[PDB]
C-alpha cells in the first residue's frame, strides 16, 4: 500500500493514496494522518515493501522505478556504500571523505577474477569485468566515467587505473596523475580539484594480458584560466604548489613570492589548501595577506605543500631528471612574471602604449626565465608588424601578453602529457583498456567557447551512449527474437550537424571568420543565424527565459540534449585560434633556452576543428571496443559528507538518462554466447550421447543439469542470453579450463541417466 510521491527537496516521500481525482492522486504522508497533498498520477510510484533493506543491484528491486532507485542508493549511501549496480552499469555516489580500507591492496586482491555480483558493487569489479572481457573476447575495452563536476569521475578513473596496474602488471601509469593534475587541474566553485582538460587513458596489454605500457590523450585544456580567475577560483595547482612548496633556493632563482604578487593569480583566491600541520611547513614569505587573515582552504584530498612534495616524488619515480623538473618550473615562473608586465597609454590620441616603469623587473625576470631578449619581448608586446611596425593600444598589448602566456603554458602542458607517454611506452600491444574522464554537459549565467566545445563533445558522446545502450543492444534482442519491450530515443544528428558539418557547421563558419581580413565575433554570429534560419536547434539570445539584453550578433542559443544553452559569442574568434601571431611565435622559437625552443619545435590553427578531429579518433576507439559505464553522482553542492540531497540526485538520475533505461536494463540480457561456441568448447569432453545432440539441445541439457532456472536465461535464435544478476552463473558456463569442462560434462552425464 505505501507509495513514493513527490517532495520538493527529497525528490520523493512515502505516503498512502487516500483519493483519486481527474489527473491527480491525493497522498497522505506516512505517520501524519489527516494531512494531504496532490500529486499527478504519473508522479506516484510503488515502493518496496521493506523500506530498511538495500540491494546491491537495483535490478533486484521488486518495483524498479526512479523513486525506488533513489531510495535504494540513499539507504546504501547512509551506510557508506557508495557503489550500486544497475545490472553491469555502476552508480557511484561521491562520499566526500575517505571511506577506510575500500581501496586497499587487500580489497584490490579480493576483486581479482571475481564475477560481477559475487563481491559487493565496486569500481574494482567494473575494472575486473573489462579485463576479463578483454582477455576472453580478445577485444579492447573502454570504461566511461560520467557525471557532473565534482561527482567523482577523476577519482574513479584513478581507482580503475590503480586496480588494473596493481592487479595485472609485473607504478608509472598511476604516478603520472600528480603530474597531469598539477598542470591541468584547478580550484573552481564546483570542485577544488576540477579537471580543466579531458582525458582518455589507455592501459595496453600484450598477448598474455599483462600490462606493457600506457597512452594518455588530452583534450581542451582551459586557456582562459591561465590569466584570470573569479575570486573563489584558482589558476592551475602547479602555481600554488610551487609557491607553497619550492625550496628557498628555487624561490630565489625563479623570483617567486606570495601569490598576491602575480596578476595571473591575484584576481583569484590566493590561499593555499593546507591543514594545521602543512601550514607550518609553508614558509611565512609564501603566504598572501588573504591567507594570513582568512587562514587556509580546507579539503580532504588537496594540500598545496604536500602535493608539491608528492609531485616531485612522482617526477622522480616516472624517470624525470632534476634538470627537466627545474626546466618545467622555470617555464611556470616565466609565465607568472610575463603576467606582471603592465602597459600605459602613449600618443596624443592614446593610439599606442609603453611598458609601465614599474614593470621593469617583471620584464627582466620574464625574459631571463624564458631565454628572451628584454627589448625583443618589449617590442613584440607593444607593436605589431604589418604588410611597417605599428603601435598597439593598451588593450591590444594586454591581449598580446596574455596570448603569449596561454600559448607557452598550453605548449608546456602538451610537453608534460607527451613526457608521461614517454615514461610508459610500448612498441606493440594486443589490446587496451581505456578510461574516459571528460567534463559533462554544463551551463552558467555566461557561456563562452570552452562551454560550447564541452557541450559539443557531450552531444557526440550522448549519441554514442544511445547507439551502444539502446540501438545496438535492442537490435541484438530483436535479431535474436527475445521480445524485449523497445525503448526509443530521438537521435541528435541535427544538433551535431549544426555544430560540425563541413562548410555550414558552426565550427567551419567560425574558422571562415578567423581567415577573414578583419575578423569579427558579430560577423561570425550573424553568419551562423543567416545560414541556420530554419534550424530548430538554433535561436537568437532574445528567445531565452540576462539574455534579454544580448544582441542577435552577440550570441546564439543551442537546444542541446540536456537543455538550451545561450552562448555569448564575444572572444569566440580569439578562443578559436591556437596559433600565436608570427612576431610572438618568432620571439619564443628564437629563445636562448633549448627547452623553450623545444616546446615550439595569417597565423591560424582552429581549436574547434582540432578538437573535432581528436573527438572523432576517440569515438573510433569507443565504437570499436566493448564499453562499461560508471555514472558518478554528486550528492550535494557543498562538498560535504553524509548529505544526500534527494531532489539534486534524482535530477542527475533523470538527466543522465539512467531513469529512461531502467526497464530496458532490468528486462535485458547483458550476458550472451552462441549455442555453437558453447557446444564447440565442451565437444571434445563429451561422450557420444552428448555430442549427438544439436548445439541448442546440448546447451539445454547443460543448463537443466546445473539447476539453472528457466527465469535466469532465455534462448535466442542462435545465442543463449543471461539476465542481470546472473553473471556468476554465466561465467561458470563460459569457463574454459579442461578440469572445469570435464566436471560439468560429468554432471550432465549423471543428470541424463
Ligand atoms: N570515492 C571517493 N572517495 C573519496 N573522496 C572522493 C571520492 N570521489 C570523489 N571524492 C572527492 O570529491 C572530489 C571531487 O571528485 P572528482 O573526481 O575530482 O570529480 P569530477 O572529476 O567528476 O569533477 C575529490 O577531489 C575528492 O575530494
Ligand atoms: Mg575531474
Q: Which residue has the cell 532574445?
A: 542
Q: Which residue has the cell 580550484?
A: 187
Task: List, by residue range, all CATH 1.20.58.530 domains of the chain.
Answer: 444-580+602-625
Give dist(CA 314, CA 504) in Å, integer. Answer: 46
Q: Write phi, then psi, for 72 (nearest 5 degrees).
A: -65, -45
Ligand nearest to the CA of 273: 1
Beta strands 89-93; 626-633: pairing state:
parallel
- Which residues, listed in sequence order, are joined to residue 437 by a DSSP beta bridge? 199
Ordered strands of the 719-722 beta sheet: 671-674, 719-722, 713-715
**What is the CATH architecture assignment of 1-46?**
Roll (2.30)
Write the DSSP string, 515-548.
Answer: HSSS--HHHHHHHHHHH-SS-TTEE-GGG---GG
DSSP 8-state assignment for residue 275: -
Q: Who lines ligand 1 at CB under 6 A?
A: 94-96, 98, 147, 149-155, 191, 193-195, 300-301, 632
C-alpha cell at 393: 593600444
C-alpha cell at 100: 577506510
- Which residues, listed in sequence order, are joined to residue 612 by a DSSP beta bridge? none
Give dist(CA 151, CA 165) in Å, integer. Answer: 24
Pick one of 3.40.50.720, 3.40.850.10, 2.40.50.100, 3.10.180.10 as the CATH number of 47-233+424-443+626-668.
3.40.850.10
Nearest CA to ligand 1 atom 16: 152
3-class SS of residue 12 = strand
Task: Tell me which of 82, 150, 195, 637 to substitute to probe ligand 1's pocket, judged by most ligand atoms within 8 Å of the beta carbon.
Answer: 150
656 with 716: CB under 8 angstroms?
no
Task: List, by residue range, all CATH 1.20.120.720 domains of the chain.
Answer: 319-423+581-601
CA 316 to chain centre: 27
The answer to whether 149 is a known catalytic residue is: yes
CA of 185 to the centre of ligand 1 (A): 13
CA 620 to chain centre: 18
The answer to whether 213 is a known catalytic residue is: no
Give dist(CA 453, CA 493) in Å, integer. Answer: 16
How many CB atoms neighbour CB 470 within 10 A? Answer: 18
Ligand nearest to the CA of 83: 1
- Which residues, listed in sequence order, are joined to residue 345 by a DSSP beta bridge? 353
Cβ burial 671-703 (10 Å sphere, 16+ → b, else e): bbbebeebbeebeebbeeebeebebbebbbbbb
- CATH 1.20.58.530 corresponds to the domain 444-580+602-625: yes
C-alpha cell at 169: 602488471
Give dist(CA 183, CA 177) in Å, integer. Answer: 10
How many helices (DSSP H) and strands (DSSP E) are in the chain? 31, 24
CA of 121 to the centre of ligand 2 (A): 22
CA of 231 to the centre of ligand 1 (A): 22
Q: Where are the alpha helices (DSSP H) in 176-288?
A: 177-184, 237-245, 248-253, 276-281
State the SS3 of 354-420.
EECHHHHHHHHHHHHHHCCCHHHHHHHHHEEECCCEEECCHHHHHHHHHHHHHHHHHHHHHHHHHHH
614 with 121: CB under 8 angstroms?
no
Q: Which atom of ligand 1 is nearest to the CA of 155?
A: 17
Beta strands 626-633; 211-219: pairing state:
unpaired
Task: List, by residue range, all CATH 2.30.30.360 domains of the chain.
Answer: 1-46
Instruction: Tell me which method was used to determine the 3D structure.
Output: X-ray
Task: Tell me which of 193, 298, 440, 640 to substitute to probe ligand 1's pocket, judged by most ligand atoms within 8 Å of the beta carbon.
Answer: 193
For residue 463, which of 616, 610, 613 has the smallest C-alpha distance? 616
The answer to whether 442 is a known catalytic residue is: yes
Q: How many residues does the chain have?
A: 753
CA of 149 to the centre of ligand 1 (A): 9
Nearest CA to ligand 1 atom 14: 150
Task: List, by residue range, all CATH 3.40.850.10 domains of the chain.
Answer: 47-233+424-443+626-668
* Binding-site positions for ADP: 94, 98, 103, 150-155, 191
- CATH 1.20.120.1200 corresponds to the domain 319-423+581-601: no
Amino acid at each position: 500500500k505505501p507509495v513514493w510521491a513527490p517532495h520538493p527537496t527529497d525528490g520523493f516521500q512515502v505516503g498512502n493514496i487516500v483519493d483519486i481525482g481527474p489527473d491527480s492522486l491525493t497522498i497522505e504522508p506516512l505517520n501524519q494522518k489527516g494531512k494531504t497533498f496532490l500529486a499527478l498520477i504519473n508522479q506516484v510510484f510503488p515502493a518496496e515493501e521493506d523500506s530498511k533493506k538495500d540491494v546491491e543491484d537495483n535490478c533486484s528491486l521488486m518495483y524498479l522505478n526512479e523513486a525506488t532507485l533513489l531510495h535504494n542508493i540513499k539507504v546504501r549511501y547512509s551506510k557508506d556504500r557508495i557503489y550500486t549496480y544497475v545490472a553491469n552499469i555502476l552508480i557511484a555516489v561521491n562520499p566526500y571523505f575517505d571511506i577506510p580500507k575500500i581501496y586497499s591492496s587487500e580489497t584490490i586482491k579480493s576483486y581479482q577474477g571475481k564475477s560481477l555480483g559475487t563481491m559487493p558493487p565496486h569500481v574494482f569489479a567494473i575494472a575486473d569485468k573489462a579485463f576479463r572481457d578483454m582477455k576472453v573476447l580478445k577485444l579492447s575495452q573502454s570504461i566511461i566515467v560520467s557525471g557532473e563536476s565534482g561527482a567523482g569521475k577523476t577519482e574513479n578513473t584513478k581507482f580503475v587505473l590503480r586496480y588494473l596496474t596493481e592487479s595485472y602488471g609485473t607504478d608509472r601509469i598511476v604516478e603520472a596523475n600528480p603530474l597531469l593534475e598539477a598542470f591541468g587541474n584547478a580550484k573552481t566553485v564546483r570542485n577544488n580539484n576540477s579537471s580543466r582538460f579531458g582525458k582518455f587513458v589507455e592501459i595496453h596489454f600484450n598477448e598474455k594480458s599483462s600490462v606493457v605500457g600506457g597512452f594518455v590523450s588530452h583534450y581542451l585544456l582551459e586557456k582562459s584560466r591561465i590569466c584570470v580567475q573569479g575570486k573563489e577560483e584558482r589558476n592551475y595547482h602547479i602555481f600554488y604548489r610551487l609557491c607553497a612548496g619550492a625550496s628557498e633556493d628555487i624561490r630565489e632563482r625563479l623570483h617567486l613570492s606570495s601569490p598576491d604578487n602575480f596578476r595571473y593569480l591575484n584576481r583569484g583566491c590566493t590561499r593555499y589548501f593546507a591543514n594545521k600541520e602543512t601550514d607550518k611547513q609553508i614558509l611565512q614569505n609564501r603566504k598572501s595577506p588573504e591567507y594570513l587573515k582568512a587562514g587556509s582552504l580546507k579539503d580532504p584530498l588537496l594540500d598545496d605543500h604536500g602535493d608539491f612534495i608528492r609531485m616531485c616524488t612522482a617526477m622522480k619515480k616516472i624517470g624525470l631528471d632534476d634538470e627537466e623538473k627545474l626546466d618545467l618550473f622555470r617555464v611556470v615562473a616565466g609565465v607568472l612574471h610575463l603576467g606582471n608586465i603592465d602597459f600605459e597609454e602613449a600618443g596624443s590620441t592614446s593610439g599606442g602604449c609603453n611598458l609601465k616603469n614599474k614593470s621593469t623587473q617583471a620584464l627582466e625576470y620574464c625574459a631571463e626565465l624564458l631565454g628572451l631578449d628584454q627589448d625583443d619581448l618589449r617590442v613584440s608586446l607593444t607593436t605589431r608588424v604589418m604588410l611597417i611596425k605599428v603601435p598597439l593600444k593598451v588593450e591590444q598589448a594586454n591581449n598580446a601578453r596574455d596570448a603569449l602566456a596561454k600559448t607557452v603554458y598550453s605548449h608546456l602542458f602538451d610537453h608534460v602529457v607527451n613526457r608521461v607517454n614517454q615514461c610508459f611506452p610500448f612498441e606493440t600491444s594486443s589490446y587496451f583498456i581505456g578510461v574516459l574522464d571528460i567534463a559533462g554537459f554544463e551551463y552558467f549565467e555566461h557561456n563562452s567557447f570552452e562551454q560550447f566545445c564541452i557541450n559539443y563533445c557531450n552531444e557526440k558522446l550522448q549519441q554514442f551512449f544511445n547507439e551502444r545502450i539502446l540501438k545496438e543492444e535492442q537490435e541484438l534482442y530483436q535479431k535474436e527474437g527475445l521480445g524485449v519491450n523497445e525503448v526509443h530515443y530521438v537521435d541528435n544528428q541535427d544538433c551535431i550537424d549544426l555544430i560540425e558539418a563541413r562548410l555550414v557547421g558552426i565550427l567551419d563558419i567560425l574558422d571562415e571568420e578567423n581567415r577573414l581580413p578583419q575578423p569579427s565575433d558579430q560577423h561570425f554570429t550573424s553568419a551562423v543565424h543567416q545560414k541556420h534560419k530554419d534550424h530548430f536547434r538554433l535561436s537568437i539570445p532574445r528567445k531565452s527565459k540576462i539574455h534579454r539584453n544580448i544582441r542577435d550578433d552577440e550570441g546564439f542559443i543551442i537546444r542541446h540534449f540536456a537543455g538550451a544553452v545561450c552562448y555569448e559569442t564575444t572572444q569566440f574568434v580569439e578562443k578559436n585560434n591556437d596559433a600565436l601571431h608570427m612576431s610572438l611565435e618568432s620571439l619564443i622559437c628564437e629563445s636562448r633556452d633549448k627547452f623553450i625552443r623545444e616546446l615550439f619545435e595569417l597565423s591560424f590553427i582552429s581549436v574547434g576543428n582540432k578538437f573535432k578531429t581528436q573527438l572523432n579518433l576517440l569515438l573510433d576507439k569507443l565504437r570499436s571496443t566493448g564499453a562499461s559505464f560508471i555514472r558518478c553522482i554528486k550528492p550535494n553542492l557543498k562538498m560535504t559528507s553524509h548529505h544526500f540531497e534527494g531532489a539534486q540526485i534524482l535530477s542527475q538520475l533523470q538527466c543522465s538518462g539512467m531513469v529512461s533505461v531502467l526497464d530496458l536494463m532490468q528486462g535485458g540480457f547483458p550476458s550472451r554466447a552462441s549455442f555453437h561456441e558453447l557446444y564447440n568448447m565442451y565437444k571434445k569432453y563429451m561422450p557420444d550421447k552428448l555430442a549427438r545432440l544439436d548445439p541448442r539441445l546440448f546447451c539445454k541439457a547443460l543448463f537443466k543439469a546445473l539447476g539453472l532456472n528457466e527465469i535466469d536465461y532465455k534462448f535466442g535464435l542462435t545465442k543463449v542470453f543471461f539476465r542481470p544478476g546472473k553473471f556468476a552463473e554465466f561465467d561458470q558456463i563460459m569457463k574454459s579450463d579442461p578440469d572445469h569442462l570435464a566436471e560439468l560434462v560429468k554432471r550432465v552425464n549423471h543428470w541424463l541417466i
